Subunit: 265 residues, 2 copies
Amino acid sequence: MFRTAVMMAASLALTGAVVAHAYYLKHQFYPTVVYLTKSSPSMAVLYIQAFVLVFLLGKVMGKVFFGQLRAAEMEHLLERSWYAVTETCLAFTVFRDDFSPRFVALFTLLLFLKCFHWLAEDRVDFMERSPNISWLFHCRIVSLMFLLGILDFLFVSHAYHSILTRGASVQLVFGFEYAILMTMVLTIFIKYVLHSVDLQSENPWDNKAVYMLYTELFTGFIKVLLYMAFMTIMIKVHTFPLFAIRPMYLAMRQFKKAVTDAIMS
Amino acid sequence: MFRTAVMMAASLALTGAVVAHAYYLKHQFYPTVVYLTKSSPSMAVLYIQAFVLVFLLGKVMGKVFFGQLRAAEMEHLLERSWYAVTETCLAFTVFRDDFSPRFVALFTLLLFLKCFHWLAEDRVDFMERSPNISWLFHCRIVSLMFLLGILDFLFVSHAYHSILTRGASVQLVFGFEYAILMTMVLTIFIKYVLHSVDLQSENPWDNKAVYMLYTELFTGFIKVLLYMAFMTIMIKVHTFPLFAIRPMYLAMRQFKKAVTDAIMS
């Protein structure tokens, strides 16, 4: 993590230089802050420092929960992160609410949770074959599962309250994304308990593995249903969705492959 | 191509039904067309029919120039097509010029040419190893090269004239994208002539292959230079680019890998 430490040190030095420049421009306490908030490049450097701190926190949390593993997990993280960044910015333009740093923070937190969900899926796929099974692995998995579930439930409840009170303007995107994340967490829990039952039973117990596949396909159906409902509401409210069309196609393709595999089997 | 024929027949039937409904609503010639252009779903069906016709023309052109080959070429086409669609819609939001079907047609033509460029790159990579070398292969390659070069030169000249006369509002995006496509066509021409020299000389003639690699890296440098210039102008005109950041990162990563490979060699 030498490169991460170097990057965070560089960002900290840059923000310290910006703060020092502002302070030496206005010796008081209020005008320096108002100049920082009025000048654009200084606020941009502050945003970069905030993003770097978020990245450091994400690295710490990933080391605590999963721990390194530096593999296709990282490649999937990068690919889905680029896709999610494109989708998020698209959905942001989808509405006139530009800038709005609180909404930017909300989107960043959503991206944080989505990246952690993808890493959880990759760790589940690694666990299904031949992991370093121990007490700590189970503890990490259950702790991450409970944390993600609690946070997702709280945020979806807040989104439901917001859309009931204010309306379906921008909070519905968060609601649907966190609903998809809840489906992902349900799939993760099902896969983990199935693998635990398979491991604790010594014998392969294949009669349940097919059932696990059944559960998987059912969950996929649920997911695609949610997505199509999203599409419906997104054509009911505004003109035409643009941000989620590619994820819709991906979900449709995955469900089609799953149902074809189930039929041929 | 059974599925493509079925899809085009379905789209043609749908547009015929829309036309018949409009005609039976207004028996004249002018009000039916004005109702089609005023109603949104009918114009959407017309747009879908236009896209399907464009897809059929693209299939015909691909069969004429490359010919099937149904491989990683198609996978790269799909991936880069999703990426380019996201980038194009992002660039469209980048400006207040919404709808504007002529600009939509221009973007569609740009996507058409970019997809054909990617297929040309994939065919070059296939040709470099062990293709079905013959007169027809050379004819196809040179014809596609000349067509792409002529079209790119004409469109970049038109973009230069537009930005000189009107200004850098939306035509600069087309100019930079077609400049990147021109660099791609230059790389394709260099690779093709290098492979032709390698094949016609019987002996491997490795002393030039390294030179070919040199040319490749040089072209990559040119590409990244163009991209950074794009970034500069895009921060000079408007607030902050959003559409091309991921392609910028991809180009930077490719150039970094190329320069590291050149240094270690």
